[PDB]
Design a protein around this ligand. Structure first.
Ligand SMILES: *[C@@H]1O[C@H](CO)[C@@H](O)[C@H](O)[C@H]1NC(C)=O
Ligand SMILES: *[C@@H]1O[C@H](CO)[C@@H](O)[C@H](O)[C@H]1NC(C)=O
Ligand SMILES: [Cu+2]
Ligand SMILES: [Cu+2]
Ligand SMILES: [Cu+2]
Ligand SMILES: [Cu+2]
Ligand SMILES: [Cu+2]
Ligand SMILES: [Cu+2]
Ligand SMILES: [Cu+2]
Ligand SMILES: [Cu+2]
Ligand SMILES: [Cu+2]
Ligand SMILES: [O-]
Ligand SMILES: [O-]
Lengths: 552, 552
């Protein structure tokens, strides 16, 4: 047990991720943010000073359960009011279990502006990891556009919508290249980068010694891109996923969607006289972004010594069978917690893309989420019944819905009610994907649950029917916090409503979140303790806690 | 027979083909240029005045045979010295046969700048076409870049080479739209163009009346793209290819490579209350350019009445079996001239991408063409034996060459010798494609012969061998002036060397010709008559012919 204290300021600054200058949101003058590293069971105290000028900020600690501390989850209008310019707020929370986690902006579209970094929790003090490696490498993946976040925000709030488009650069630990390639050698149509190694966009090189084994920790905070990770001539052994251990298996490359984290081990077996390419390319959408590239540099080979091969070609973006083939393998490591065999609640959530009042919105069982100005945790503790809609949101959709047709948008509305759970319910969620407004298009959506991990019971094609029950894996299902629904399919997850608080469950692609694609879960709120005053200080909660009468 | 006289001035001007201003090369203030139309048997006289400030100009008339007028072909350094600023040149030639032709700049990269237009030839007066139609719709296809042609020229001549990239826009009759789509209603990701229809980039709408039949004449002067043409809900019957009638067949779309012209017939037999999409999309290279679109407007429907369907989705760019399936189906119309059955000369031309002295160049049996300052025709007529290389260029490549693997570049040279034929020779040219510099890459190349039409005897995969001799079509082969080689395959054509003059045979993709991909054929020059002085007044021809002694 130890307290790790971080003194942090967030400020916009000029920076050039791909050697083209723009503004980035840096923490203590650096981009990406600093790494937090602690051992399981420690308490992390972060005092954040907001040094932005007109904007409020919040930081969300992705994958941390916020057990006892629902108020530090870092979701504006759900766990807290956002931190005002010039104010300091303390995020104090216990890191319970080891893993590869990260943190990112959770207000507006501030994470796409660069607010994110690594949070790595080692085993309890004195304990060892269940596997052996001699070194580790940390990789955080993100994506980068050249337009302003605030021009992109106004574009997605406009009628007609101005879609943000495919990213200009895929960043690997904050660096990437635009309009040139470090692997130009293999193709005369590519431009060589004129980089010395010193630049803001020069690639983070992976230095390794031959005949050793390493843990490569990989996390994604992309706003949109689903990426594919591969190392030339090196097979990967998947050992951890979303802070939990999986039954190990070998693969030549992994798919990683936004909100996921993996640990993969590699052994430097291959010929020690050469360097090998690390390639991270786009999958799941039709690519119009070059691959993020770097070198697995076998010491003492010169880093200017190119590999003999081109980078590994990324698998075809639309080979979803290949995607499923990897996704469906992941199973819990033996010794993990097995699900409750019987559920107490099952909810069906239909994911549609709609047009509400001329605005292209995303909707879950026809409600497109719009968050209130009063934080739900505050509202529910103080029992302010006028702060949001108290009607229960829709828990099932019409079984006569044709998931292969565009929506009609007849009854689609905007709303902000909450699904409430009784503290201890075993909840089941089947996420159903469908056709979007464009004929014959259904996309992949990564869904992430705050303040909990869930067991991934299964995935299927088409519409979920009750007869699907015997395929659900109750024996070995992995424990995760992020999961994908594939085109035209469903996914079924199970968790226990055991953590007092108001938690978000939303699609982790930042534009879809900005357009309403998420729901809010709240359970055991009468068990929440005292919330920090700064978290209560706005909306309905400020109005009703500030004693300010009249005549007095 | 009439004499059709044109009086034209070539000059640059600001123009916005896609509503983005740039400079374009216009004729008499027009972009594209004026249509020439004549009847077979007429003489065309074009007096062209050069009003570019510093640059020479020539205009090549694609598909006209220049029988008796070889000096009028418009190929700088082959038929003539270019026309200097402020000078006027007379191109006087006959049109022998009916067909869809066009004209384009043939000095440096002037045609990519906009120097092109149509040249159509009707049947002899009194005679009629073998097929009936009520209307005619004419369409010239090109592609457009937003970068300067003089920066593209320099970039292609630099070490490292700077590839011109995929075009920004496809131009249908000089017009196209960039960064928005006139079909944006079917996909919220697309930006709607705001166009009242009066703009320079506003679509050229095809107006048709119901229950009528129309001949749609389509020609391509693209610098780089291979395009696929389709109209929503309508069948296309192919009746003419390169000024020659083909045996008719119905197809749902046609593929068209740079240098080809087709005439298709359609019938307006569909639901008369709606309009339909015309889509010209990129194939044979990974697309990065949006499709060219316009409407088949069934009168009296308002042209702003959009179609119920989206535009026909383009065939997958790399399905070369679908491409070959269209291409192989083309045969001469019943009654056409059949080939001489025995040949007198057979030449094998291997097509490779090479690196000669740091520069990426294209080579034909390892000679990358560099054209001399003396025009070959004048040079050969006056027997100027030092103006270019008198050593006969290779008519065969080595049988130990592996076309599946990159060149070694060991012997690759730049050259300018000429292949010579005796007037009356039947020549067969076997075009062999091979792997490029990148591993596992071979592209399509359209090849075009000047001053002759040829029979396309056949195509095949891999390297041509004596086993393939029996597959050559000698019954029904089509007469064309442009033919394609597919990835790693061969194409065999046969023609008779019966036209006195010096003729270019080259790939019609403008960068490839700029990089050396062409050969020069000469036949019967002893029988060429008087060459206009402007065509002789440069290089070694002006040297020998201008009598300016010294001491005399
Ligand atoms: C957070 O921890 C710091 C350091 O122990 C303490 O000063 C601060 O008051 C704590 N705030 C809350 C809300 O726990
Ligand atoms: C071309 O035609 C014009 C007009 O008839 C004539 O004056 C000129 O001399 C001709 N030149 C040649 C080379 O035929
Ligand atoms: Cu989270
Ligand atoms: Cu997250
Ligand atoms: Cu989503
Ligand atoms: Cu979230
Ligand atoms: Cu041509
Ligand atoms: Cu030509
Ligand atoms: Cu593509
Ligand atoms: Cu070519
Ligand atoms: Cu030519
Ligand atoms: O989370
Ligand atoms: O020609």
């Amino acid at each position: 047990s130890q307290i790790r204290h971080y003194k942090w300021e967030v400020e916009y600054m000029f920076w050039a991720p791909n050697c083209n200058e723009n503004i980035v949101m840096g923490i203590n003058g650096q981009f990406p943010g600093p790494t937090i590293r602690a051992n399981a069971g420690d308490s992390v105290v972060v005092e954040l000073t907001n040094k932005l000028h007109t904007e409020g900020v919040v930081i969300h600690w992705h994958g941390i359960l916020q057990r006892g501390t629902p108020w530090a989850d870092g979701t504006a209008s759900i766990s807290q009011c956002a931190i005002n310019p010039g104010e300091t707020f303390f995020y104090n929370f216990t890191v319970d279990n080891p893993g590869t986690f990260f943190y990112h902006g959770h207000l507006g579209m501030q994470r796409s502006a660069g607010l994110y970094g690594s949070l790595i929790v080692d085993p309890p003090q004195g304990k060892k990891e269940p596997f052996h490696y001699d070194g580790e490498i940390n990789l955080l993946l993100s994506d980068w556009w050249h337009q302003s976040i605030h021009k992109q925000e106004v574009g997605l709030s406009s009628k007609p919508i101005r879609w943000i488009g495919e990213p200009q650069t895929i960043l690997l630990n904050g660096r990437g290249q635009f309009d040139c390639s470090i692997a130009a050698k293999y193709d005369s149509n590519l431009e060589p980068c004129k980089l010395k190694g010193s630049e803001s966009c020069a690639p983070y090189i992976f230095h390794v010694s031959p005949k050793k084994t390493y843990r490569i920790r990989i996390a994604s905070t992309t706003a949109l891109a689903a990426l594919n990770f591969a190392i030339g001539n090196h097979q990967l052994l998947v050992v951890e996923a979303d802070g939990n251990y999986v039954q190990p298996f070998y693969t030549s490359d992994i798919d990683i969607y936004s909100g996921e984290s993996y640990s993969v081990l590699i052994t430097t077996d291959q010929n020690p006289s050469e360097n090998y390419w690390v390639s991270v390319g786009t999958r799941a959408r039709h690519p119009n972004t070059p691959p993020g590239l770097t070198l697995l540099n076998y010491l003492p080979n010169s880093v200017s010594k190119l590999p003999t091969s081109p980078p590994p070609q990324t698998p075809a973006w639309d080979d979803f069978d290949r995607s499923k083939n990897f996704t469906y393998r992941i199973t819990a490591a033996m010794g993990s917690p097995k699900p409750p065999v019987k559920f107490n609640r099952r909810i069906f959530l239909l994911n549609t893309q709609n047009v509400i009042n001329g605005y292209v919105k995303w909707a879950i069982n026809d409600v497109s989420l719009a968050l209130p100005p009063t934080p739900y945790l505050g509202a529910m503790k103080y029992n302010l019944l006028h702060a949001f809609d108290q009607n229960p949101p829709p828990e099932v959709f019409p079984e006569d819905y044709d998931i292969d047709t565009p929506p009609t948008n007849e009854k689609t509305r905007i709303g902000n009610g909450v699904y409430q759970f009784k503290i201890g319910e075993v909840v089941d969620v089947i996420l159903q994907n469908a056709n979007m407004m464009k004929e014959n298009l259904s996309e992949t959506h990564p869904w992430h649950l705050h303040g909990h991990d869930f067991w991934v019971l299964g995935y299927g094609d088409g519409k979920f029917s009750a007869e699907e029950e015997s395929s659900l894996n109750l024996k070995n299902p992995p424990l995760r916090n992020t999961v994908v629904i594939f085109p035209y399919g469903w996914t079924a997850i199970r968790f226990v409503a055991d953590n007092p608080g108001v938690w978000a469950f939303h699609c982790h692609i930042e534009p879809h979140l900005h357009m309403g694609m998420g729901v809010v879960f709240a359970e055991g709120v009468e068990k929440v303790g005292r919330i920090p005053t700064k978290a209560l200080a706005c909306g309905g909660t400020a109005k009703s806690l500030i004693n300010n009468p009249k005549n007095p």
